[PDB]
Amino acid sequence: TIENTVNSVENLFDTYKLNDTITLKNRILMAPLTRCMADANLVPTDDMVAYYARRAEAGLIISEATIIRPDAQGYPNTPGIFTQAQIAGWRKVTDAVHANGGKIFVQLWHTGRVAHPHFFGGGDVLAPSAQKIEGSVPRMRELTYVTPKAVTVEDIQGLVRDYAKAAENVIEAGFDGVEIHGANGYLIDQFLHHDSNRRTDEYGGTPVNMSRFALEVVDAIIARIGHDRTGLRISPGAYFNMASDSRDRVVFDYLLPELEKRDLAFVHIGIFDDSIEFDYLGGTASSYVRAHYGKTLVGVGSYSAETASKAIAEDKFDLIAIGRPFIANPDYVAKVRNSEELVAYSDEMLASLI
Ligand SMILES: Cc1cc2nc3c(=O)[nH]c(=O)nc-3n(C[C@H](O)[C@H](O)[C@H](O)COP(=O)(O)O)c2cc1C
Ligand SMILES: CCCCCCCCCCCCCCCCCC
């Protein structure tokens, strides 16, 4: 059991060969963490360069979610990678991480129905279906979510194009690869769940159809940058801006073996506390995926170094992403290596980019 922790987490420091292109120096990933600190042009700042550079002891950094085009924006100051200036800003980040002996993937984002037109000149919010989420944008004054426009198949083609163009830009910006943000209720996840996907065309209504958009995005990105540089984050369990539906499981039962055919760099779970069991998945999100997918898996969500080490020892997943503790402890890896006390995260830490 994971709770029966032991007095060594040596396995976290194992070298891990993702594939013939990339070997990680340890099993510890910096989880993607939106910080809302990019500039008015959504260009990474020199403060963001320093922030990522000081975490280069991680085996791999996954960047904050990075938007693929303007109508993807749902939160303030989230960086993009669709303009030349954005590419140049990210190149400073990746050069600094590499110079510090690290590796970094960008996380490519479209928020779908969680976008807000305040950020993009009053344009249409896009989603699989005209199903609005509840509420308003967090930490902003009165930006109520709107009913999305159900994308047309031409919109879908343009979105696939723009994911692929972003992936090309990512390589120009010097990243080691891309994590596709297929998780946490955002655009790709919206196609994979019945709450958000009420379509009756070739993108809805069956597991094959509901998986089609995700697989088209994956395949278009692989065609641009290669499978060894492409990972995917997924949320089989509904929990953020997503209502649950008992039929969603069979979508993922179809998707996961299809993903295995693409020989991705990794699949990564998107969850906050992986100790939570989901009724519809027969247990935890990671155990569900591990039962349906036989290649490298990144676990995440309320793990300590000790419980992550135990889970990996027990073959539950291969790599551990660490989120909140990497905000509270820039030197997380060194402190874990040296058995030093770690500071607990508090939400108040988000005000500071350190
Ligand atoms: C402030 C904050 C921002 C986040 N932003 C993202 C994001 O950009 N992309 C994403 O996929 N997950 C995001 N997450 C989720 C984390 O990647 C991670 O799954 C979560 O924090 C659980 O891991 P932890 O317990 O180690 O923090 C965010 C989490 C937090 C706390
Ligand atoms: C945007 C990143 C930071 C978000 C902070 C607020 C928390 C969002 C995630 C909530 C995690 C708990 C989910 C409750 C869902 C029920 C599932 C069983």
Q: Would you list the domain boundaries of the chain?
A: 1-354
What is the spatial distance between Cα 253 and Cα 190, in angstroms, rounded to a whole number? 16
Ligand 2 center–CA 113 separation, angstroms: 17
268 lines ligand 1 (CB under 6 A): no
Residue 241, both tokens: 């801006």
What is the spatial distance between Cα 9 and Cα 97, in angstroms, rounded to a whole number? 25
Residue nearest to atom 12 of ligand 1 (CA): 32
Q: Checking phi first, is residue 269 left (phi over 0); if not, alpha (psi -120 to 50) or beta?
A: beta
Question: Contact 321/272 with Cβ under 8 angstroms?
Answer: no
- How many other C-beta atoms can be found within 10 angstroms of the C-beta atom of residue 255? 26
Give the ligand with the smallest distance to the CA of 186.
1
What is the spatial distance between Cα 108 and Cα 354, in angstroms, rounded to a whole number? 23
Beta strands in the chain (DSSP E): 16-17, 23-24, 28-30, 60-67, 104-109, 126-127, 149-150, 177-182, 230-234, 266-269, 277-278, 283-284, 297-299, 319-322
Pairing of strands 16-17, 23-24: antiparallel
Grouping H, G, I as helix, E, B as strand and the rest as coil, residue 178 is strand
What is the spatial distance between Cα 294 and Cα 200, in angstroms, rounded to a whole number? 31
Grouping H, G, I as helix, E, B as strand and the rest as coil, residue 234 is strand
Give, for ligand 1, the residue of 29, 33, 332 to mutate: max count of ligand atoms closer than 8 Å to Cβ: 33
* Nearest residue to 111 via CA among 66, 143, 166, 142: 66
Which residues lie closer than 8 Å to 107 by C-beta, 6 or more apart?
A: 32, 62, 63, 64, 65, 66, 178, 179, 180, 181, 233
Ligand 2 center–CA 272 separation, angstroms: 6
Asked whether residue 198 is marked as a ligand-binding residue, the answer is no
Residue nearest to atom 2 of ligand 1 (CA): 33
Bridge partners (DSSP) of residue 268 are: 233, 298
What is the spatial distance between Cα 145 and Cα 275, in angstroms, rounded to a whole number? 31
- How many other C-beta atoms can be found within 10 angstroms of the C-beta atom of residue 101? 9
Declared resolution, Å: 1.1
**Which pairs with CB-CB distance under 8 Å and at least 24 residues apart come from 250-253?**
250/207, 251/192, 251/193, 251/207, 251/210, 251/211, 252/192, 252/288, 252/289, 252/292, 253/207, 253/292
Residue nearest to atom 11 of ligand 2 (CA): 272
Bridge partners (DSSP) of residue 283 are: 278
SS3 content of the chain, % helix, strand, coil (to 5): 40, 15, 45
Which technique was the structure solved with, according to the deposited record? X-ray
Question: According to CATH, what is the number of the domain 1-354?
Answer: 3.20.20.70
What is the spatial distance between Cα 6 and Cα 287, in angstroms, rounded to a whole number? 21
185 lines ligand 1 (CB under 6 A): no
Residue 301, both tokens: 């969500």
Question: Contact 92/63 with Cβ under 8 angstroms?
Answer: no
Grouping H, G, I as helix, E, B as strand and the rest as coil, residue 315 is coil
Which residues lie closer than 8 Å to 4 by C-beta, 6 or more apart?
A: 310
* Nearest residue to 185 via CA among 278, 115, 252, 94: 115
Grouping H, G, I as helix, E, B as strand and the rest as coil, residue 253 is helix
Asked whether residue 21 is marked as a ligand-binding residue, the answer is no
What is the spatial distance between Cα 297 and Cα 316, in angstroms, rounded to a whole number? 9
What is the spatial distance between Cα 101 and Cα 111, in angstroms, rounded to a whole number? 32
What is the spatial distance between Cα 307 and Cα 287, in angstroms, rounded to a whole number? 15
Q: What is the chain's alpha carbon radius of gyration, rounded to the nearest angstrom?
A: 19
